[PDB]
A paper describes a structure:
To investigate the molecular basis for the inhibition of PRC2 by chromatin marked with H3K36me3, we sought to determine structures of PRC2 bound to modified nucleosome substrates using a PRC2 complex containing AEBP2 and a construct of JARID2 that included the allosterically activating K116me3 segment (referred to as PRC2AJ1–450). Analysis of the cryo-EM data of PRC2AJ1–450 bound to the H3K36me3-modified nucleosome resolved two distinct states at 3.1-Å and 3.5-Å resolution, respectively. In the first state, the H3 tail can be seen binding to EZH2 and entering the EZH2 active site (referred to as ‘tail-engaged’), while, in the second state, density for the H3 tail appears absent (referred to as ‘tail-disengaged’). In both the tail-engaged and the tail-disengaged states, we observe JARID2K116me3 bound at the allosteric site on EED. Consequently, as previously observed for activated forms of the complex, the SRM is folded and interacting with the SET-I helix of the active site, and the SANT-binding domain (SBD) is in a bent conformation (another conformational feature associated with an active state). In the tail-disengaged state, no density is seen extending from the histone core and interacting with the structural elements that channel it to the active site. There is residual density at the active site that most likely corresponds to a second JARID2 molecule, as previously reported in structural work on JARID2-containing PRC2 complexes lacking histone substrates. While we cannot totally discard the possibility that this density could correspond to the N-terminal residues of the histone H3 tail, this tail-disengaged state lacks any of the other contacts with the histone H3 tail that were previously observed in all other cryo-EM structures of PRC2 bound to nucleosome substrates. Similarly, the binding geometry in the tail-disengaged state relocates bridge helix residue Q507 to a position where it can no longer interact with the H3 tail as is observed in the tail-engaged state. The mixture of tail-engaged and tail-disengaged states observed for PRC2 when in the presence of the histone H3K36me3 modification suggests that this mark impacts the efficiency of PRC2 to engage the histone H3 tail.
Numbering used by the authors:
A (entry chain A): 81 to 152, 156 to 167, 182 to 223, 228 to 254, 295 to 322, 351 to 362, 426 to 544, 556 to 682
B (entry chain P): 179 to 295
C (entry chain N): 4 to 93, 106 to 410
D (entry chain L): 80 to 441
E (entry chain C): 17 to 181, 220 to 339, 426 to 746
F (entry chain B): 108 to 120, 138 to 166
The structure:
Amino acid sequence: ADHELFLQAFEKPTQIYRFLRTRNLIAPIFLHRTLTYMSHRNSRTNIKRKTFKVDDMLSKVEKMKGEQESHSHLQLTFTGFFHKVTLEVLLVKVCHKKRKDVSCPIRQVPTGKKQVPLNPDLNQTKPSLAVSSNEFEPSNSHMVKSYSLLFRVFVAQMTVFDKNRRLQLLDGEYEVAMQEMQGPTLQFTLRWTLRIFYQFLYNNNTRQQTEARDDLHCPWCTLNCRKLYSLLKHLKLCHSRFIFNYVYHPKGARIDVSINECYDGSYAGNPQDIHRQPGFAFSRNGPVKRTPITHILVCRPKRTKASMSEFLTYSSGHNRLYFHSDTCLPLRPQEMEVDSEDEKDPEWLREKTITQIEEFSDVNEGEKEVMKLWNLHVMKHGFIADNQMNHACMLFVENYGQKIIKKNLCRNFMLHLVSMHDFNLISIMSIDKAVTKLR
Amino acid sequence: RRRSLPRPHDFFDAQTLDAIRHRAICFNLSAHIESLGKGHSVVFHSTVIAKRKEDSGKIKLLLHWMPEDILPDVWVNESERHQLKTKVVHLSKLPKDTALLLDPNIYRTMPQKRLKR
Amino acid sequence: KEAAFDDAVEERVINEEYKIWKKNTPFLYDLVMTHALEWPSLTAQWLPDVTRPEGKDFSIHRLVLGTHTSDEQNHLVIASVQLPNDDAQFGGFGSVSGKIEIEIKINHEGEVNRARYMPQNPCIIATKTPSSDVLVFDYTKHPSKPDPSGECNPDLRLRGHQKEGYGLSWNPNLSGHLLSASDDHTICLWDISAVPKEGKVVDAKTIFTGHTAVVEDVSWHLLHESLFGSVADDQKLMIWDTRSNNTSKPSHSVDAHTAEVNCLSFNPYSEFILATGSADKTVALWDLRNLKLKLHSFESHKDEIFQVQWSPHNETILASSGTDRRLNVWDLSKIGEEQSPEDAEDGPPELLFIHGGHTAKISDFSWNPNEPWVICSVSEDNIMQVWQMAENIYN
Amino acid sequence: YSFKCVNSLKEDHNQPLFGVQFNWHSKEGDPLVFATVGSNRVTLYECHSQGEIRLLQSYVDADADENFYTCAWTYDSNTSHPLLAVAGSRGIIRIINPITMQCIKHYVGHGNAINELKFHPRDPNLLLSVSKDHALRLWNIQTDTLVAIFGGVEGHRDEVLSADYDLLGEKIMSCGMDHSLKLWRINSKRMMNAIKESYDYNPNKTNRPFISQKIHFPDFSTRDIHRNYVDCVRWLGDLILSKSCENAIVCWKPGKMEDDIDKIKPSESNVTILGRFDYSQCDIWYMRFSMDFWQKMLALGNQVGKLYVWDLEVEDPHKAKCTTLTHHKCGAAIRQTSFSRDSSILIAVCDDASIWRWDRLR
Amino acid sequence: KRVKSEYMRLRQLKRFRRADEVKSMFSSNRQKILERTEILNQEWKQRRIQPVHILTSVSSLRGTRECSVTSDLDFPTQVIPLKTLNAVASVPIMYSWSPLQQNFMVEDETVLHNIPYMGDEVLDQDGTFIEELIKNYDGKVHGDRECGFINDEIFVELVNALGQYSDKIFEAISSMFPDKGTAEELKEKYKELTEQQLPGALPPECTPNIDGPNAKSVQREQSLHSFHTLFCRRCFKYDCFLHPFHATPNTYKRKNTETALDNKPCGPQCYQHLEGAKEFAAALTPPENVEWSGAEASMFRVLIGTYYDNFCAIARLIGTKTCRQVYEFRVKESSIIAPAPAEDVDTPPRKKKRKHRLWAAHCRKIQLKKDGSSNHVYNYQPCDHPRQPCDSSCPCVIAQNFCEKFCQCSSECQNRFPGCRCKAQCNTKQCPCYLAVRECDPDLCLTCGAADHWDSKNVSCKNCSIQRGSKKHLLLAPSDVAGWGIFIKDPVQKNEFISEYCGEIISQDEADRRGKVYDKYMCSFLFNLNNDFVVDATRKGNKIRFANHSVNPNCYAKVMMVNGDHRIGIFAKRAIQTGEELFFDYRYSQADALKYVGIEREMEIP
Amino acid sequence: RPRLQAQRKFAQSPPPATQISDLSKRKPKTEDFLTFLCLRGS
Ligand SMILES: Nc1ncnc2c1ncn2[C@@H]1O[C@H](CSCC[C@H](N)C(=O)O)[C@@H](O)[C@H]1O
C-alpha cells in the first residue's frame, strides 16, 4: 500500500495557496491589516482631519531643504584594458513604458569612437577623451527614465542617475571588471566639467504525523496572526480547501486539517464559457453576454467580539448553465428566450403514425393515405375537445384543399366525414363546408 | 446537505497543477524560499561588480544582485564587501512597479492585447 | 505564442483569488452585493438623487450604466439599486425580488465608454463618443422599453471630435458646459445652455489643443467656474483657463507623471487641490498654486490607472481604479504616517483598503453623494458590484 | 498473406485498452502511425519496420477516473493536419491535434458512455458516435455543431456499441444490446441537407441555435439474425459483417436476394443470410473485428489471443479460409483489430494493456 | 428429434439450389467492393497530409507525470512525459428519449428482447439477480437455447419426417424451431398456402381501394369496417397509440331532425320536382338514362345512412350520380335493399332548477364513503352494453367512475356531472371538478371558460391546463443533488401548473416487471398512476422526469384523471422564484425512499 | 440456459513528526529535497 493518493489529494490545495502567497504579497487582493479579526494591525487610528493648507507649505519646505544633488558637464578619460584595441561607447536614453510600449523603450545616441590600449602592462601609461552635452532639461527629459552608459570593446553597462534622479557617480578613477562575451577588466576615470500542533485528516485509519513551528504565521500564506482566534478564522476564510478542527493540546492548542468535502463555487465567471472548446473560451477580446445574476454575501454582519469559544449566501439568478433537453447541448444565453425545445407535434410521432397506419394488413393505401394525413393534421394542432374537432376537420380541409383538388381524393375523404357524423362530431352543415373548400 | 453530495467540477484543471508543480520545482532549486527565503522572502545574490576609486584610499563598491527582479544596482561602501554577499528581501518591500519579472504568473494583464483601450 | 497558456493558467488563478476574496467578504465589508449584466458597462456613476422609502429598511438608488454589445444594438441604460438604509437592516435585507432593476433602457448608436450626468439636471446625460459626435440623452422622454427601430434619436449631438475618447466632465458651476477628450489630441468646448434653433446639432464652442499626444480626460474646478484642468498621454497634464482667447497657451505650464496619464479630478471641498492618475501605476495629486512642487504620488497599483474619484462626503478621502483588477481608496489624512512593519508590509500608510471584488479591469466607479460611504465598480466582465468598508478602519 | 510476428508491448497503467485505429490518411511513404485508446490516456504509436514501435506523447485526462474506449482518425481540410477524436466513459468526445501536441475541441451531449467511433470516409469533418444511452450522434467538426440524432426508441432500445459507414458513405449500420441491426441512410436528402446546413452554421452569425433534427426511424430492423448480443458491425459492399457471442460471424443483407439495397422500404423485413464464419472461445462480448482497406482479408481477435484470419473472395463462405495465427504469450483477451492502409501491418488490442503488432509476409 | 435433421437436409437441398445464387452475389458485390475502394484509394493519393513530429518534451515535464511502455521481447522501454489536456465539465448520466406531450400505450408482451448489463462483480458473489429477473417473465431468454432457425421450406419439411402419420408432425416441428412454437398456427398457415394468397394489403373482397380503380359496390358497414376498426373514439385519432380497438362501432343515434330537407327547387337535376318522382319520394318519405357505376352505388349505400332526406346533397357528393337519377336509383336500391330506422327519442320531462344540485349531493356520498373504502382507483373504461343500465355491471359503475360523454350510457344518466358550475378559476373548493380531482372537460364546463378562447393559452380557468396543453417554460440543468434537474425560468405562484409527468401507459404487471430492473439500475421512474395503469417515462416523456424528491419538496404531484385518462399532474407546493430546481414529494414508501431517494438538500439549519 | 447467463464481460478467474517542512515535502515531491528536513518529512 502507498499513501501517495493522500499527498496528491492535499497537494492541489497546497501548491495553489503557496503560489497565491507570492501573488498576494506582490499584489494583495485586500489589505490584511484591514480585516476585522486582523484589526490588531493598522495601529494608525483615523483621528486626523488634515486640512488641505498644511501639506503645501510642508512640501515647499521639503523642496527648499531638498535639492541635495547638483550638476553643471559629465566627462571621462580612458586608461586601458586588461586581459589574462579601439573601443566603442554609446549613450542611451530610456523612456518609461507607455500604453503602446510592451516594455520601457530604449533609445541610443551615438558618439565618437576612439582607441584604447590593448591590455597595457604595469607603468605603461605615458589621452582618449569623451564629453557629454548639457542637454538635460526638465521639459525635454520629463518623460525619460534614468540615463545609462554603454561600453563595448565585451559589452558593459552602467547608469548615471540614482532612483531619486541624483548623481550616482563622482570624478575619480574607475576599475571596472568587464563582462567579456582577476579576469577581464577595464580601467578609466571620470571627470566633471506558545506552541501549536498540526494534523492532516483523510482516511483517518492512518496518517503522516505532523508538527508545527512559527505558530502565529500561516503555513500557506505566511501571514503573522498575532491573535490565535484570528489565525484559525483566517484559515477558515482563505483556505476553504481545508477543514480545520481545534482540540486543546496538553501544552497549548492543536489544529487538524482535512480536505474539503464539497468545496462548491469552483467557477464564478460566465457559465457559457465553461464547456466551450479552447481558443474561443475565456477570450474577453470583445464583450461577451452572460445571464444576469444577483449574489449577496454581506448585508449587515453582527460584528461580534473576538471570542475563542466559536471554535471547537443569498442568490437570485440563473447561476448554473442550462443544457438542451433533447441533445444535452449547452444553451446560449441569447438563444435562451425561445429555445423551449418542446412543442405539441414532435416529428418522430409524425413518422410513427405514418409507419403504423401503413403497416397494418387489412387496409390499403387508398384509405391509409387519408388515415395518415388526418392524424398528421390533428396532432399538428393538437385538438382535444369535440367542438375543437368540428373545426379540426375544417382546418384539415383548409390546409390540404389545393393538394386534394390536385389529388382528387374527395370520395376517400368522404369516408372521414361519414365517420365524423356517425360519432355526431361533425354536423350536417359542416359536412358540405368540407366539400366546397375541397375544390 | 447530506452524506453523498456531489463535488462540483473543479475549475483548476490538472495541467495547471502541473504548471504550478514545475514552478515549485524551479523555485525550490533556484531561490530555496522555504529554507533560505524563510517562506515569505526572496534571497538576492550579489556578484563581483566594478569598483570605483574616490578621493580617499577606500574604494566605493558596487553590487548587483543575481535575480535582478526590480532593484537597480546602487553603489555601496567598502564595508559591504563580504557582508552584502547575500541579502534577503521580503516580497512586500520589493518594488511595486517592475518586480513582476521574477515569474509572469505572479502578475500579468489578463486582457493582454486589448481591442479596446 | 505562449501567451495563451499563461493567460489560461492565470485565469484559473484569478478565479481562485475571487473565491478567496468572496469568502473573506463578511469580515472585510459591511455590504457585499455583486450583480451580473447582459452586456458590460464602461460607466459607473451614481446618480445624486436617492429616494428613501419609509418603513422598510432599504433605500432606492439609481445608477447610470451603458450596454457594451459586441453583436447587437447597444443601449443606454440606467439601473436602480436597493441599499440597506437602516442601522438594523440585517432572503437578504430588503425586498427579495428587485434589488437590481433595469427599468430605464435607451437605444444608443454604439457602446457607452464614459457617461457623466449633469449635477444641474441629472436627466441630461452625455454618452461620450463612440463616434465623431457626442450625443445628448434625456432619459425622462425616452421610453423604458428599448424600441429596436434604429437609434433613440438623441436630443442633441455635438460636433468637433474626430476619433473616440474616454474623458468627460460637466461644468459644476456653469450651466450647459461640457469638455471631452479624444485620441485626436484635442479637447472641445460646448455650450448646451441654450439651443433655441432647429437641427439639434451644437458645434464645438472652442477647440483646445496644447498637448503633443492623446488627451484622455478633462475636468472643471468646483470652486472655479473658469479654471479647468486637462490631462493627456504626452506624460503631461495642463491647466487651461477660458476667456484667454488662446487655444494653445495654457494658464499654467505644468507636467504630469513620467508615463501616460489618463484621468484628472478635483476635490469639491477645496479651492486648490487637484489629483490625477497615470499609466505609470501611480496616482499623484497636484495644487493650483504649487504647480512645480510635488506633494505626493501613490504607488499601490501595478498597472495603468485611468480613473480617480474624490469622495463627495469628505475632503481627505480619494479613490482610484485601473487595469490592476483592484479598487483603491486613499485617505490623505494618514499620508506619510509612521506605522509598524506589519502595517507597512501590507501597504503604504496613506492607502486605505484595496477593493478586490472583480475579475476584469474596473472600467469605472463612483461614490454616491447620499450615503456617507457608498461606491460601485463595474468591469468588462459584466461584474456589477456595490461594496462598503467595515467601519473599523474609519470608525 | 500469412502473418508472422516476434514483438509485443505493454502499458504501465495496466487497465484494458479498447481500440486501435491507423492513420490511413497518411500519405505514401509516411511512417505507420496509429492511435490507441483506453485507461484515461490517449497513447499514439509510430511504426516503421523491424518490429520497432515508437510512442507519441500520450494525452491524459487526469481530472477523473475516465475510461477511454474510442479512437478515430481524420484530417483537417483547411490546414491539412492529422486529427484524432477520442471519446470515453464520461460521454465526452475529445479532439487532440498531435501536430501541436494539444487538444483543440471537445464535444458534450452524450447521455452515457461512448463506444468506438468511425469517421466519414468522404467528408473528414463528420464524426459518428455510438452511445450507451441508445443513441447515435453525428457531428460537424468544421463548425462544432450537432447534426441529426439517431437515438429514438424506434432505433436501438438498449446499449449501442458498434456503427460503420459503407465504402461510399451512404448508409449506416449499427448494432446494440437488444440484438437489433438497423440501417440509416446518409444519402437520404434530409441528411445531406442537414450536413450542408451544419457546414453553413456559425454561432456568431445568427442568434437562432442550429436547428438539428431527430431521426428515430431507420430504414430496416432485424433481431433474429443473432440470438445473443451483437457487438460489432462492418460493411462489405451491400452486405453486413456482424458478430455476436454465438461464436460465429455472419453475413446477410436486408430484403431478398434480388431486392435492391436502395429501393427497399422500412416495411420490408426479409433477411437472407449468405455467409457465416466459425471460430472458438467467443464468450465475452466487445470482441470486435475490422478489415483491411481493400477488404480482401479479415481477422478477429480471441480471448486467448487467437487471430482467425480469412482472405475474402467470391468463393463460398463455407470453405473461405481456415488460417489461424497465434502467439504463445498472447493469452490475454482481445477486443479490437486494425489494419494499415495496405495489409502489411495488423495491430490489435488486449486486456492487460498490451499491444501486439502482426507483420504481413507479402 | 429427427424433425431438425429433416429440416437441415431440406435446407441443404435448398442451399444446393442456391449455391449459384450465393456465388453470383459474392462476385457481383466483390466487383462493387473493388470499384468503390479504388476510388477511395485514389482520392487519398490526390492530396498531402502533414506528418506527425517525433516525441518531444516540454520544460514543464519536470513537474509533469511521465509514462513508460515496456515490451515483451528485447525492445527498449520507451518513455514519454504525459500531456495533460484540458478537462471539461462532463454532463451527468442520461438516457435518450423521444419527446412528446401526451401518453403512449406499450404492448405488454412478456418478451425481454434484451438482458441489461450488470456490474459483472456482484454476479460472481451472487448472480441470482438475473435469474430472478428472467424468472418473472419465464425461465428463458430471447431466442432460448434451441439454437435453430431455418427457412420456410426447411421448417415445413421438418414435419415431413412424421407427416405421413399432421398434428404430431407440426408439434414436433414447433418443438424443433421456436419461431412458430405451435402446431395450431400450422392450420392457418396451410389454409393461406392452399389459397396461395393472404387477406391482403387491401379490403379482402377483391377491392384494393373503394375509391380506387376497383370501383365495386359495397355495403355501408363493410366500407367503414376497416375505417371504424382503426378509428379510436377516445383520442379521436385513427390507430390510437394509447387506447385499444376492442370497442363497438359507431352504432349510436343522432339528431335526425337536422336533415329537414326544406322544400326548394334543385333545378332540372332533382329527384324531387317531378310529379311521379316527387310522389314516390313523398310515399317513400322514369328510369335513369345513365346507369350509376359501382362506386356510385357503394357511396350511395353509405351516404343514405347520413343524409336520408335531401337528395340534392347526396347527388352533390357522388360524382358518378345525378339528382335527376337519384329518385330512380333510390327506388331501385329500396327494391334491392332495406331502409334504416334512424332511431331517436323525445323524453319530454326535464328540470334543472334543483335536480343538478340533488345529483351533485348524491355523487358526494358515493365518492367519499363508497369510493374511499375501495382502496383502488380503476382506470376509466366506458361501458357500452345495455346489459346493466346504471347497474352494478357497467365498468363505469364498478370502477365508481362517471358515465361521461365517452360512455355509451343514457344521454341523461345520473352517473355524469354537468361540469363546472363555478367561474372562480376552477381550482377553489367550490369547483366540482377540482373537488372530484379531475380537470374540467371544456365541452361541459361552459362557466369557467375552458372551451372559451380556445386559441388562448393563458386561460383564466385553472385546473384545465393539461387539456389546453399550455405548459410553462421549463429549462434543463444539472441538479446539485443527483443527476440532472429541472429549473424554471419564470416565477410560479400558489398551485400554478407545471407540465404533466408524461410517459407510457402500461399495465400494473408490466410496470412491476420493469421495476425489477429499475431498482437495480437505481434510475427508477415508476410511482403508481391507477389500479390498472402505471406511467413509465424511461423511454418517452419530457423534462418533468428530471425533478427530484426531498423531505421538503417545493412542488406536489397528485395523480389525477383527465378526460377519461389518468395523468400525473405537477403543481407547485409554494411560490418558487427563477432558477430553483423543482422538487415534488413522490409519496414514497419510507424504507424504500430512504434506500433510493434518501439524499437531502438542506440539513437541520435551525 | 447458455444464452440466459449474464454477460460478465471478462474471465471468471522520515516516519517521525515533521514541521511545516513537511509542506515543503509535498509541493516539490521530486527534484531534490530543497531542505534537509524533507528527508525527515518523508
Ligand atoms: N433527491 C434525490 N437524491 C438522489 N437520487 C434521487 C433523488 N431524487 C430522485 N432520485 C433518483 O432518480 C430517480 C427519479 S427520476 C429523478 C431525476 C432523474 N432520474 C435524474 O437523475 O436527473 C429515482 O430512481 C431515484 O433513485
